[PDB]
């Protein structure tokens, strides 16, 4: 579909104007002018054009090269002149370059027509066919058969005029046009104006090059966004583990393994985390939050019959999760599973290019579709256990947390090959001989718009220490966002999904915090949002945006919001009953909330709550239908509230899940005494 020639058609005569780079897949390398809507009608005037590419015979002949114009051309093969009408020799089986020059003056048509002819020795001649022509070998290195070598000095095939000023590409046909920006035509038409470095083959340093990107000849599975040469496409992986089973492990002092199960099996939150001021680590990590609520009252050691000499172990379902622009083929990353600050309890490790399936961006390995992984599977005999000593036991259950720490062995590449048009795993290619380089010269930008989870972006910028990183165009703040996380601006105001920038904060390293607060200063500006248009991004700079309706852990986690938003998000109820509470609640609002307390206040202002234990606070569900049902009977001994008096109150109270305790307290409690909750509903008996 791509194959053929590459071809640069010029409005001037003399190779210096292009106004159109496409390729054609068979010797047919016409453009009608029905194909030039988006380039003005004064200049789909070609007074010159160079098609370049290699052809390969099926069978080794003597051919003789014809064009349609051939007194306005001039035609290499191998660096030999075919044309400037003789007959060569060609051999099956092996591959020659192709040049061709045409110039033009002042034609009196637009676009152009123009047929590439060979005749063979049975005297047959034909436009040359698709299966006998190849495009040039715009990579970094020549591969065996097919060498590299029009102003291209990163040969990745957009002639540096055009990378510098700005370019458009447009889906014709089944053909892909690379024109020149022009304000009036492309500004109302609403296409992507791409600048990126004559200099970088990719100009986000990853391994796509800006014309793979930009044509399409590149991984169906990299991001929508990663294809704009200024986007970096990486993997970015985390673990995610779903659900726990603690067991105490046999002893072989114990002869008997008759005895019932006691394990203690929980649900786990996790999410990907960054540490910061925004951090400069690289590091992959997620938090694993381990559900503390009701699963009577016995300490983890009482319930598994774990005396201080026993150790445990722990198995849980994961599964990894790409949240990077990149796809993973043959490495999982190796990750390890942490206790406390620095306790290692497991490494865990899938097996190399044995791979079940792809690990595509955003989305998991294994896909939601299918099982996830359990950390000793069933089938498997060597699964490594993940133990913890008497101690490391009692630490679990007191912290309730986990961590797992990811690297970033990514394993090869899938790359396009210009000799067959085809994407395939390269095994000479490796993400680890790119991602330091990506690191080196993008700015990365952490935003948790999409449903509060830290999702990071590196987004090609200037260094302006480094000559070659300084021949990339400026990136600015506004539209690092727009490109890079899909920030859009329907009104003058730049907002992302229908939020506007400003219910986002900015957070900065410190290197970046001072230089974006020098670039302000030049700017004689003291509102960072209303000039993002007019601040510019470095390399290495780190930026961190949340949005603000919500408080955050070190971790950069959503745990908590101000007492009035969580009031106001609940002022919506639906119905209410003796049973419970029917509400419509934001989804991100239900992220933040570790549960509810009930209770009841009667006449003197006396309260009984209802579900009075730390956990016993799990009394809502999502309904089928998205509305939240709070329900009051859970933890009443499954009766509705009896409410002895209609001027008594129902209050119903959240609790944030930084307020939220996940351990009986140092004197022994187990109640909701002393936890700090919000109230969300508060109506008497006959308002019920
Ligand atoms: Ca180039
Ligand atoms: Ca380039």
Redesign the pocket.
């Known amino acids: 579909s791509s194959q053929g020639l590459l071809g640069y058609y010029f409005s001037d005569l003399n190779f210096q104007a292009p106004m159109v780079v496409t390729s054609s897949t068979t010797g047919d390398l016409s453009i009608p002018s029905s194909e030039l809507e988006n380039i003005p009608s004064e200049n789909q005037y070609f007074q010159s054009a160079i098609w370049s590419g290699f052809i390969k015979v099926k069978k080794s002949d003597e051919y003789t090269f014809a064009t349609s114009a051939d007194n306005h051309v001039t035609m290499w093969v191998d660096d030999q002149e075919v044309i400037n009408s003789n007959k060569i020799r060609l051999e099956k089986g092996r591959l020659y370059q192709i040049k061709i020059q045409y110039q033009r003056e002042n034609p009196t048509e637009k676009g152009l027509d123009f047929k590439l002819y060979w005749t063979d020795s049975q005297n047959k001649k034909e436009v040359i066919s698709s299966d006998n022509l190849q495009l040039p070998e715009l990579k970094q290195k020549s591969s065996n058969s097919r060498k590299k070598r029009v102003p291209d ?2 040969n ?1 095939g ?1 002639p540096d005029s055009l ?1 510098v000023e700005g370019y458009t590409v447009d889906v014709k046909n089944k053909r892909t046009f690379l024109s020149p920006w022009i304000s009036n035509i492309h500004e109302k038409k609403g296409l992507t104006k791409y600048k ?8 986000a340093s990853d391994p796509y ?3 793979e990107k930009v044509t399409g000849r590149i991984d169906k599975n990299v991001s929508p966004e990663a294809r704009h ?1 200024l986007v970096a496409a990486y993997p970015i992986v985390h673990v995610d583990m779903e659900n726990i089973i603690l067991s105490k492990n046999e002893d072989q002092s114990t002869q008997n393994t008759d005895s019932q199960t006691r394990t203690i099996s929980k649900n786990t939150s996790t999410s990907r985390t960054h540490t910061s001021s925004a951090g400069f680590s690289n590091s992959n990590s997620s938090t694993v939050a381990i559900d503390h609520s009701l699963s009577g009252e016995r300490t983890f050691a009482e319930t598994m019959g774990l005396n201080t000499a026993d150790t445990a172990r722990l198995n849980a379902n994961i599964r990894y999760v790409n949240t990077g622009t990149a796809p993973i083929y043959n490495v999982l990353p190796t990750t390890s599973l942490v206790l406390g600050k620095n306790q290692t309890l497991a490494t865990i490790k899938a097996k190399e290019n044995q791979l079940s399936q792809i690990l595509a961006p955003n989305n998991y390995y294994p896909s939601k579709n299918l099982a996830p992984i359990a950390l000793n599977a069933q089938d498997d005999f060597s699964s490594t256990p993940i133990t913890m000593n008497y101690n490391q036991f009692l630490e679990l259950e007191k912290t309730k947390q986990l961590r797992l720490d990811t690297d970033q062995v990514y394993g090869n590449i899938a790359t396009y090959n210009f000799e067959n048009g085809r994407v395939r795993v390269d095994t000479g290619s490796n993400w680890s001989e790119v991602l330091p380089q990506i690191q080196e010269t993008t700015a990365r930008i952490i935003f948790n718009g999409k449903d509060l989870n830290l999702v990071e972006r590196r987004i090609a910028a200037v260094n302006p220490s480094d000559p070659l990183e300084t021949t990339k165009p400026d990136m600015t703040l506004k539209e690092a966002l727009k490109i890079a996380f899909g920030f859009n601006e329907p009104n003058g105001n730049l907002q992302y999904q229908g939020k506007d920038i400003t219910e986002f904060d900015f957070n900065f390293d410190q290197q970046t915090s001072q230089n974006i607060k020098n670039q302000l200063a030049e700017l004689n500006a003291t509102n960072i949002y209303t000039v993002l248009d007019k601040i510019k991004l470095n390399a290495k700079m780190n930026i961190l945006i949340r949005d603000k309706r919500f408080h955050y852990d070190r971790n950069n986690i959503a745990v908590g919001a101000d007492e009035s938003v969580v009031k106001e998000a609940h002022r919506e109820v639906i119905n209410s009953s003796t049973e419970g509470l029917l509400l419509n609640i934001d989804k991100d609002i239900r992220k933040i909330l570790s549960g509810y307390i009930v209770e009841i206040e009667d006449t003197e202002g006396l309260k009984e709550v209802i579900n009075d234990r730390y956990d016993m606070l799990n009394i809502s569900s999502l309904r089928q239908d998205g509305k939240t049902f709070i329900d009051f009977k859970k933890y009443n001994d499954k009766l509705p509230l009896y409410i002895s008096n209609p001027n008594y109150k129902v209050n119903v109270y959240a609790v944030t899940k930084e307020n939220t305790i996940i351990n009986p307290s140092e004197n022994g409690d187990t109640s909701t005494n002393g936890i700090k909750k919000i109230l969300i509903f508060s109506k008497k008996g006959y308002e019920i």
């Open positions: 000095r990163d990745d957009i990378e990126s470095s004559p200099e970088k083959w990719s100009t090059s800006d014309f040469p």
